[model samples]
Target: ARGADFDHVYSGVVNLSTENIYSFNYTSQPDQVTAVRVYVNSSSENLNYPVLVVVRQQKEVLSWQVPLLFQGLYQRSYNYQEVSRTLCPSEATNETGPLQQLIFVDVASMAPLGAQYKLLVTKLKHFQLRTNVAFHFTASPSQPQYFLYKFPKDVDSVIIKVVSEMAYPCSVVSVQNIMCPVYDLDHNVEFNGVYQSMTKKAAITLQKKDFPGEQFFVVFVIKPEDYACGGSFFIQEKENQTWNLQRKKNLEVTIVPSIKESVYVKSSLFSVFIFLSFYLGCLLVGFVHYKIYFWNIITIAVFYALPVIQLVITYQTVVNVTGNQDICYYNFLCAHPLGVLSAFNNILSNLGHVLLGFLFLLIVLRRDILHRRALEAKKHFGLFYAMGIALMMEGVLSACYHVCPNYSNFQFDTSFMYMIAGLCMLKLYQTRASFAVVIMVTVLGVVFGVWFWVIFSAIHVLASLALSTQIYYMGRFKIDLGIFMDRMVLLVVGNLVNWSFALFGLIYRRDFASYMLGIFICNLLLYLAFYIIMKLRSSEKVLPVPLFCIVATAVMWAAALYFFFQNLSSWEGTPAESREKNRECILLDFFDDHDIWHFLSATALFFSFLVLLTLDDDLDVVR
Candidate 1:
């Protein structure tokens, strides 16, 4: 039986165009042999006349680029030539092959509308009679823009398939008239559910359960994900004809649970109680010990309590799953019972900073061991406490960001940590210079500190100038660079470069790998600088303690660096779907470069705290 008529003639003489390719659908007689008469009117009047034709069959899979052989040598005002004949099978002895269901004509490059041109295609049977329908290219089609296909009623299930060059999300929606009662990540309760797949070709099959009116509104959304390749969508009906070209609507299906709903441990109550008990216990002990400075006791208690507060907050706050869903890996260490705590791993890790702060406080107060130079300790006690407070602040803010994982929180954490580095430089500057110069330097540093690059640039200049001035004074008069002054210079120069590289990595490179490298180099440079300063002062009693800490810190740092590089370069063949699904695996998630770095660096910083505890004013000199 003949179908609806599909005759069209695309006739125009235009100026220019942006759309390069134009295509149309064509169906052949089931059993009868067929032929298509393609007529193209080329003008030889102007050199710009339509002279080239690129014909494609079925979404440009099978294509032929044809150039006009007869140039029509004689030039005239307006000379026209029309060519129309059988498109394929020139020889009668050859077997008549199968026909393509789709035809695409690309004439944008050759068919510049300098003169009138017409494109017409006629589908016929037995090389004589025209069929009910003829197909041709048009600016627009009067038929429904989407291909409407009826579902096979006898079949128990309907399979919706999507094809693409790269991974994309494909959905199938079944609508009973207008109301699509699907409840999915993208849609509302009006639809049953949305079945989505991330792959080059996704086939979503819906079985007979809670059915919509009849058929499925299958569609593929070609959305560009971050740093991923873009591709086109293709949906074919039967075998060759494509459906839902540039369509917007999607289909929904009834979702019946195939697996049991996963259950997660909700033990926030127990964690909260444990956290509070430890914090309160420290607070009680601090109050009873009158000999200790109240601030020192308070700082220790706060460090102990901070993680608990953050963990509770993390539990209460909704998980911020913007890109990937899984938080950690499912390795032996991570996926096991110990790894359960890894979800709040950052919070637990911040407690290490608290310990560092507590240690700094112990050194300043001399609560554990009384240093002989009590008077000299009294002079720089304020600066020592400031460093301790900065360390605690860094930990607290970092934990806050981990709990909330948003832009605002991340900025707050990183910015405050940079500020601590600035504080360290300022503290060193104050220790070496006179009161007047120290005051001036402090004002300058704070003024420029509002912006990251400004402060970093300003301090490096000031640090260099200070060192130059120190050398000048030493040359004029035999001024001895004491242990304190030597270490102070080392601290200023080392921290400035360290913070600059890290900030540059974060702001410019925009990758954790570079930032991790920056931090590693910074740590190495810092310890090396200190080691050199200690060596210069031959009678340095504090050398051995810092030397031990530096060695331990370096070993751990190397391991962290190895894991970071490994994680960054690995995972080549892994698909996005697998990454998203298996996000909680060991090597994939938990012990990732950044998380490993965080834990290892926490240990490194603790060793660093031990090194700082040995820092005391040189008893041989007076400021």
Candidate 2:
């Protein structure tokens, strides 16, 4: 089988019967194979004939050439004495490798035993190793715990060793602050895996803008060898292409999550009780105002304006709960993303209050004129009042925006408000609204009073609680108020004492009920003092009213206390629900204080009698 080609390859045998035909006269035989072999006489190492063809043993051929080494006319086939080598371009070089003097991991030439190694190469044509080098480090934790080995003074690119540690191994982990692949998390159990051996090194270069203070960690867990932990190590090289070996310091810490929170009275029950008491006081004032139909306009104005002003001062608390007025919360306006319409409505509401006040003032003026039988007197005043009221309402609404910045479209709303107030003021200067001055003053007084009681009280309550808690617990024993104020002294001393007592209950593991009861009792005394002040606003004397308010408050508080304890035992199965169950009974007991409420009622009756008595006779201005 000596002739022709098989498939696409050429046949080697030209003649059918020639064995090792066309033998070269001057060369020896090349390498031999047991199964098969091919050879050709040529200048190139590879044979020129490309295609494979069918051939028998007799179809083998040999060609001729002069041996470059054996010049004395040798004649033998090939033996494995000479080596073959490939030529490379003179200008060719690897474009990518270890950066400058920095080391890189080489996977091709790595030993198969599992320990890793990085390839280190030099790039500087002239090796001048300087000492003032600086380096930068970025780790996986992004903020890894590390300390400097030796600080640099002048140069750039300082290298220091790095180590990483963790409890569980992730398949892809960070080594020496650089990202790298590690043993997969599944295969790893509790094993100590070597990322970079001590022999490996890295060159870290720093710029003037780079971080000067760098930390490196050599941290890993101590665990069984079979299970692997994921971590990596890194280091910078010295000036002379050597590894920097001054060990870097790292912090050791173990993170454990706890299930239960320790409750301290200062931080918990007592503080919460005091806050609730203040909240209740504000609510009580608002509730009483709500029942009085005569104070509606004033009450509504106070309701809107006071909260706004309080937000300006005590915004932190408002933001904490509502997540509005400043920073937007996640759920903010989810249902209605556009709150601009509501803001405009608020502006309109303020304008409406001003108008109502003017309207009421007009009604009062009409009554006075009709009763006095002075219809002719209005010619000088009627037009003036109509114009003056419009101007005042304009001014009040216009100034609303400057007062509260939180509302939407505040400036636009305010402009309308101011226009109304200005028109009202013009009529006031013309003597039209003069007769209604007293009524206007009263309305203003009531509104301002409600603002102080409701808004200011709530604001101060939250602020005082926060500051008191912080000073007593988070800060040093000494108080810090930034600026020196006389009130600061009392607040400091008072908070310290209160916080100390509350903390004692916590430290000694006392019951929370005791701390809460103490705070409640303290609040009762304060509430009693407030009641006393209100009661004493009678008989043209301050002293007696206060005394009566105090006495009344104590009696009511005592009754409440008795009822609280009385119901505690009977409601054992539902202790938590007991307060709600006994709430109405306790309220009834407070209002049933005949001596106090009756006396206060009589005093109010006396004032009413005086007003009614003066209604007769010729305008008793002196009375």
Candidate 3:
């Protein structure tokens, strides 16, 4: 049950005449011993060995400058010695520099008292016994050297001899074989190679040295797949002599049996959560649109301030996302030197713009309330729709051109969708395209704008939409549902996609891809829902229910804003939210409709935050 009798020893003795050499030994067992040495002593103390210096161990070893127990002992020593029969270092280690210094000794014959030397010999014997374990495993020395054992039936005790020239630590390194597969039981069926090891290195003998064996999946260090041509040993071996070990640079490996690779890198759960929050926020904003008409300017002013307040929540989402947007130069907002978080903050910072846009839209959209100027009121409403469309256009274009980043391996499809969405806006507002044109354009744009995976994803979306639309039409749109029929279609599709991606993330598989898919799904459904309202004739006022929902959304957003302010010390001069001087505080600005929308949206987000915090599984706040 063992390899042929063999013993490899490291034996050498420095001349006692050497000034730097000071050694002592203590016997801990019949044949075990502990060796002590001060390999290098720069201290100028006149001290010689061979004196009985008792040793002990402590829970810890610290520098204790105690009163000399027997005169002239100014240094420290271990107080608590471990009572064990073994070869342990009993002396204080003084090689305390940046790099650890190596101390070599060859004392095979010297046996100490009290079983110390005996324990040392015993440990060496154990080490030698374990050395012959792994004869074959992946990532071994180029030369496969294994000792042929006499015991044919038993596999546990076998001889493994690594080619000395090929294995590293050439000065008689030891090795052992154990069972540690990278893949688990289900995956174990895929790889059928031998497991060999003492340290991390293992040699998997694919083909015999004398005869060429069938090549398994040829292994190589993963130095970029391009760097490795079709060769067995393409990459240079490291000084450590272990190439392509687990979690190392080794990706290429040759195995006789083939196994399918498992999937990895799905969507980020954070991204999914943020996007859901955003959509819910939007829904709330949509719900609050009605209050403005009844309450007049006061309600409208609050609505106008929503986006500025919500900027806090949006800023949080931007910072927490793993993906960096500052690198996206195509995004006018993110390209600012203020950095990513700042860029978003700048965009949301315009309280003045928000106020202005709300006032303008309100003034223009309001039907002849002042009896004196009927003609002017009609003109004003026309201007109001025009201004809203203009704001949407700018937002769409900037998001497309500046925010959507283009990378070699990366596909930023989101901004592209935003860009196409801009064109659709022009057709709707400027050209006044028919409903057929709008549908066709929206479909084509979404299909083409999404990443390759999402093109197939849209199939599910279309199916869901068709089903929902058919159902709604069959019922004649009789039910005054909170959500629009078309949007319900999109929502069903989106929910499927989100949960599907979420599932992959949950299993810790396909994280990045799933994350991207989740965001896309969420944005798509929410956009569809919101767009139904946008599609209405500009002359029609926003519905009361949807208006109330928007107000509630504003309140929620305000809560989020309050939290953000509490968290961050400041949010000034941020490039993303601010486009001009004195526009620093979004609470003050009143020009941009986008800002106004967001200001109210912020309040809604704050309210949503409050609800979210208080909400439990028992409560049915789907958002």
Candidate 4:
């Protein structure tokens, strides 16, 4: 026995000559009986050199057996002090098992302490779980938000896919999250898992010239109908990097800028060559026939050539800038993205302006051809020349603004628009006033700044009223011609009023709707002014044919107004998610509402030109 006090001690002991055995019974405490120790207290003659110790439970089974070293049982052995240190568990907890427990909670929990514990543990474990440093964007209940993602290293491309319970518009590639050139359905991709939602995928590829750390922030714009959603993206890796090749194949980046050259190459080249050839030929014709009127030739040629020049400019700008690049949305007029024909709205409308100028040029040409007297009468010829040159200059400048639209060009266009209106005003004034009227109007046009439109309109309206009074007096206070005021005065005042309304829109209500309303107002004013004039001046001498032309012009003007307002309302009423929707038409990819406005407005002016040629007193006298 090793330091054990037996309950009963037998004093007598007997041993056989070959071996010795001893027995003792002892009660043990559960905590202290973890291991049993044995000792021999006999003399050297009865000493045991080696001992085999066996441990057993009370049943027929044994616990363990070991050989005891008899070198120093009672004596002490050296015990070295160990440094106090932290002890780590052999293995970590089964985190998956605990996480799965959250799904197994009882539906009817009277006192579900286990469920509560599981939730707490799950939360704690989730907090402990490692997460990558992810970029953040505001996910509020109300308005949509945006975020920018940039690569830290060179990547081939990135892909983004979103998932949501409810359909919501999302972005994979965009500039300030405004528009996407590739794979955008009304400027957004819907994330609902269905066969027929808005869209499901968005991917962006990089060009070799792009910077390595280029950022492509995925923007998640929430619609009014959408709830919470989730999204993810993958960056392609190359070289020695570990890449998910299968994922790369699955989420291949197809949104590229490859379509830049193929779409409009032939059209662009043909436009340039045809436009330049015609323009050069016209210049040649003018040089030979009207050598003295070199400025007139150049002006007419520029007016005719503007549409092609603008088309070429647009083609170059759009081609150089890839689809994956960022294009700033300057204003509502220039909100159209590249690669679509709608981007040519400004150019096409400017072309329409040129067409009106050309129509007027034809009227002047007809007058010059029919009346040899007018050509020799340079004083009257100067008036036609002035009108034609002013019209052409206005058209050219308008086209320039559209070609490279910006604040500077916008200002220039406004300035030039008012200047042309001033020229028209001076033409009306010249019909009745001294030569000094031209000098005074030219000086006033150059003197005013951004407020020039207002000042010029005031000057034009006052001069027009004075001319109307003069014509009224000349006609014995009774209307004679089919259009009120002189036909020229009416046209000038109409243009002045239109410019003033448009300027008002720019200065005060800076919205598409206001500008659209201005256009509608301008055409409506034209129709009403002509209707009043024709009805008031109706007579047997004033043939029904001229009045019918007036009606036709008015109808065309109404059509232009109708188209403009319709497109404006449709665009304005659209949700913010679809604000940048493509304005291209399905049946006709090369034309849209703006183009229709151009054609309609031009047609209206063409009819107006015919009416002016037939009705204007000075021109009709020669006829």
Better of 1 and 3 by lDDT: 1
* 10 residues in a row with least lDDT, candidate 2: 329-338
Please list the residue runs of candidate 3 whose C-alpha ends up more than 4 Å from where it truly belongs after superposition: 1-99, 102-356, 362-386, 389-433, 448-623
State the lDDT of candidate 4 residue by residue for 2-55, as single tens digits. 222323232222222221123333332221211122211111121132111222
Question: Which candidate order results from sorting by TM-score in descending order?
Answer: 4, 1, 3, 2
Ranking by lDDT: 1, 4, 3, 2
**C-alpha root-mean-square deviation, each candidate:** 16.6, 30.1, 25.6, 25.6
TM-score of 4: 0.41
Name the regions of candidate 1 deviating beyond 4 angstroms.
1-180, 183-342, 367-369, 372-379, 421-508, 511-544, 563-593, 615-623
Question: Which candidate, 1 or 4, would have the higher lDDT against the true structure?
Answer: 1
Candidate 2, residues 562-600, lDDT tens digits: the string is: 433432111121111211121111111211122122222
For model 2, how big is the CA root-mean-square deviation? 30.1
TM-scores for candidates 1 onward, in order:
0.41, 0.17, 0.21, 0.41
| Tens-digit lDDT track of model 3 for 136-246 | 322222111111112222221221223212222111111212122111111121243332211112223211221122111111111111101112132244332121211
TM-score-wise, the better of 1 and 3 is 1
Specify the poorest-scoring 10-residue window by lDDT in model 3.
258-267
Backbone collisions counted per model: 24, 47, 116, 2
